[PDB]
Design a protein around this ligand. Structure first.
Ligand SMILES: [Cu+2]
Ligand SMILES: [Cu+2]
Ligand SMILES: [Cu+2]
Ligand SMILES: [Cu+2]
Lengths: 467, 467
């Protein structure tokens, strides 16, 4: 007559959920097949004085239950002050650490801080290369992104991005257009090291929050150089190799980068009402510019479909939609043309913003989150990724964040994070008929979650191709 | 087609589980009827430099979903170094904080540090008074326990305990007997305050670990005054009012206190083969002594059955058993006689230690934990509380800690905590046929858990009468 929660877990499979907790200061791996946390780590134990555990991505492991590795980064300084929490810390740490952590079959082991190895500290999205030989991090306080070597944690290339607005006033700096510079960023210290750990490099004193594009324009974000901000978000990888795409929130574009040859090749134009691309101009061997006549909308989330045939960029706030390019020609990204826009009448207000996304392994469906400020219920939209139409929206709870998916394609596992002070949980949805099977405890503020992949192929639908 | 985890929750009822997470630095409330974490708090956010969030207990609320209060304490100093975690903070904050926290129906709000209010800091067990008008804390580094008023957070009474060994050598200091002093503490600062926060008063640098009785005898616990140690653990409450019982680990006795009159009245002797009690001697209006000819075994967990008819004290390590007194005479604890001992062939070695307990509402059964060091399976023993025998033992996983029960008596809800570095979980067992229904994710190193009570009556089986 009693129900055994074990019966629930039995159907999910031998998959390991990993998620960091933002203001909780912790990261945890969970065994979906038993309901046990496998191990957890509190960064404060390692002298971290502002352990805002932000983004993460895990390398493929042949058996996650015996061992896996992952990267998780952190944020600090004034980012401690921007949620509902009445924080009382004098002199927070600066964050921007890039921690390397290994689960050994029993515990998590801190291996090192890659920001100290490389010299470069970055605080927003973390992705793995499709070869699983490296990883990338973006940051929108410094506006730098880089790909790092897995074995030595040294920077393979870093790029730095700057805004030169047509109108020198915060309110019009983006709307009235400008020129973005893409700059090769090279080390300064012995050892080929950067001098950019912690708050070194910050043009603004915290990451822009959702809608925070309005706050910066209204002069309400402090920083040394807000007029120069582009708010880089992510550096996402083409599952086919060669290309990395850096997303830029404030000017509403993506830059496609040639990873091995270390040049940008194409600028994708996000908003409805813009061409497929803007023109990339080379200024010298290390400097490119791109001219943006006006910014119609900021964008945010960016990602490839697991076969690399589609590239997506979400417009956010001013427009709320999913922009889709035909990325089928792997040879030449200057040829990638817009082929669809996903819209809904639901999406006409400032909110919801269409954010984190995961594809099914066959690329036929996507799960994309719908984020709102308190107190509107946040949730998940099911998208037909062949016709480019919304199939359904399901309502979940406050502050929906990331989605991941079991590699068999059967279950979408996401996190809700309570705006750091309220309801938080793991959500499980089956993808056969798109029903929510329900919620597991998760006393954490997650802005990321992955399922540990086993193979290079699994990476195509983990934290590699999308955020 | 699919199993919905919701169906598991449906059967549990509208109950709220709260637990702190020791090295996770966090405390979290969880809704058993949905699987959601309702709210969590990270003490680092408040500039707590050693948030070892240790014990806790919750006041009754008419509707815990709309609001409840709770007390959670912390530890610090060298307690940070006692797990397998390679902690890197060499000089941690002192801990001993006594946090008052209110869940307000949406978030957890830190209300104050009662140790700063009162001036007294204590790091081990926290219990609620049976009137819910106050709480108590004990501490085995400074050997002080106290009952505090709920409204002002000021000390009603505090008692300090001190050991004077027959033989002045740590190996023999307890086995060859001695005199324990029970001393009334008075405030020494302006404003009714004590001067006992943080490390002030410590005789030893960390709380004795399970087995730690041997380590202190072997000279291996550093400290100003280890020959004077008694390792106070708790102050538990008679559900009938009037009496409080302080447990002393090293000399293996419990002291019964008259709460309203602020005198000790009786000393109960723990080990199998000692009398019911030892003789309390009054020295002056603030000083009592008790002479202990030899200490046969240290003890640990102490608690009353919910009707107050039985009082239990566990012997641990040298003997492993449950000592039981007849406490039916509410008017005179000098009359309380040993009436039974629960033993098992199961309990043969040094380990398991039987460490935490919860009763059924009708007092007919008790659930008690079985703790071992890694890696032996830890678990739960079901005790017939009428005939005083072990009914059943179930194996669960690593590092079993506390037990609570839903107030309808239907489900035992415990925590397992991975020795701070490995697997951790919430466990649910039904009490009708004593089967483990399964586990829930819990990325915390819990040393305590409660279900938020609704009435004074519920308190008799919560963190008030037992630990
Ligand atoms: Cu992002
Ligand atoms: Cu974030
Ligand atoms: Cu105890
Ligand atoms: Cu403890």
């Amino acid at each position: 007559k009693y129900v055994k929660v074990q019966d629930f877990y039995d159907q999910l499979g031998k998959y390991v959920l990993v998620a960091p907790g933002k203001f909780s200061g912790t990261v945890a791996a969970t065994d979906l097949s038993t309901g046990w946390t496998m191990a957890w780590l509190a960064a404060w134990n390692y002298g971290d004085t502002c352990p805002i555990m932000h983004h993460m991505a895990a390398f493929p492991s042949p058996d996650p239950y015996k061992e896996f590795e992952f990267v998780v980064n952190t944020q600090g300084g004034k980012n401690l002050f921007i949620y509902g929490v009445p924080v009382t810390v004098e002199d927070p740490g600066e964050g921007m650490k890039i921690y390397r952590i290994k689960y050994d079959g029993t515990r998590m082991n801190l291996q090192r801080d890659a920001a100290e190895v490389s010299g470069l500290g970055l605080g927003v999205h973390v992705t793995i290369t499709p070869e699983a030989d490296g990883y990338a991090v973006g940051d929108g306080q410094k506006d730098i992104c880089a790909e790092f070597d897995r074995e030595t944690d040294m920077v393979r290339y870093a790029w730095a991005f700057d805004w030169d607005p047509n109108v020198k006033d915060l309110k019009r700096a983006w709307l009235d257009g400008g020129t973005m510079t893409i700059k090769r960023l090279k080390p300064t210290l012995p050892g080929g090291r950067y001098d950019l750990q912690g708050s070194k490099g910050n043009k603004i004193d915290w990451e822009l929050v959702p809608g925070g594009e309005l706050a910066i324009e209204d002069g309400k974000v402090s920083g040394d150089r807000p007029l120069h901000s582009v708010a880089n978000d992510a550096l996402v990888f083409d599952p086919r190799g060669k290309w990395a795409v850096a997303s830029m929130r404030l000017p509403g574009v993506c830059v496609v980068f040639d990873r091995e040859n270390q040049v940008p090749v194409a600028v994708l134009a996000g908003p409805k009402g813009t061409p497929s691309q803007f023109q990339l101009v080379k200024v010298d061997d290390d400097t490119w510019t791109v001219d943006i006549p006006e910014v119609i909308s900021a964008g945010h989330q960016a990602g490839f479909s697991p076969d690399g045939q589609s590239f997506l960029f979400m417009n956010s706030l001013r427009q709320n939609n999913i922009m889709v390019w035909d990325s089928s020609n792997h040879d030449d990204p200057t040829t990638w043309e817009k082929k669809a826009v996903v819209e809904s009448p639901d999406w006409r207000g400032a909110y919801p913003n269409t954010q984190h996304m995961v594809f099914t392994p066959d690329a036929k469906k996507i799960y994309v989150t719908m984020w709102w400020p308190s107190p509107t219920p946040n949730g998940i939209a099911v998208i037909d990724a062949v016709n480019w139409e919304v199939l359904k929206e399901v309502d979940l709870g406050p502050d929906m964040h990331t989605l991941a998916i079991t590699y068999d394609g059967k279950f979408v596992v996401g996190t809700l994070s309570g705006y750091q002070n309220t309801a938080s949980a793991i959500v499980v949805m089956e993808t056969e008929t798109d029903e929510v099977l329900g919620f597991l405890p998760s006393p954490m503020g997650h802005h990321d979650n992955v399922i540990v992949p086993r193979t290079l192929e699994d990476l195509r639908i983990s934290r590699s191709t999308t955020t």
